[PDB]
């Protein structure tokens, strides 16, 4: 299929996370990165979305195929049917805003 649906593990702050390259940009699984680095630092993906809006960052929406792959990889939980992706640079911007704004 199309290259945007091909997953690969990449490094993020010393950890491995799932990624898809969409529109020429390498994006990583937001919920997964959240669980790994902001689980307590902010507590709540709802807050992440709020901050992302303010930072003028609009996450890419995962298509059905990508969601299924992420669930299979354990990147997102079995009951999850929706997932968003953002660039590593944007995640760092988000991370900085949640911890050292």
Curated annotation (Swiss-Prot):
Span list, region DACHbox-N: 8-94
Species annotation: Homo sapiens (Human)
Function according to Swiss-Prot or TrEMBL: Transcription factor that is involved in regulation of organogenesis. Seems to be a regulator of SIX1, SIX6 and probably SIX5. Corepression of precursor cell proliferation in myoblasts by SIX1 is switched to coactivation through recruitment of EYA3 to the SIX1-DACH1 complex. Transcriptional activation also seems to involve association of CREBBP. Seems to act as a corepressor of SIX6 in regulating proliferation by directly repressing cyclin-dependent kinase inhibitors, including the p27Kip1 promoter. Inhibits TGF-beta signaling through interaction with SMAD4 and NCOR1.
Entry's localization field: Nucleus
UniProt note: domains: The DACHbox-N/DD1 domain forms a structure containing a DNA binding motif similar to that of the forkhead/winged helix domain.
Residues of the full protein shown: 184 to 282 of 758
Similarity comment text for this entry: Belongs to the DACH/dachshund family.
Subunit (UniProt): Interacts with SIX1, SIX6 and EYA3. Interacts with NCOR1 and HDAC3 through its N-terminus. Interacts with SIN3A through its C-terminus. Interacts with SMAD3 and SMAD4.
Protein name: Dachshund homolog 1
Tissues/organs with expression: Widely expressed. Isoform 2 is found in brain, heart, kidney, liver, leukocytes and spleen. Isoform 3 is found in liver and heart. Isoform 4 is found in spleen.
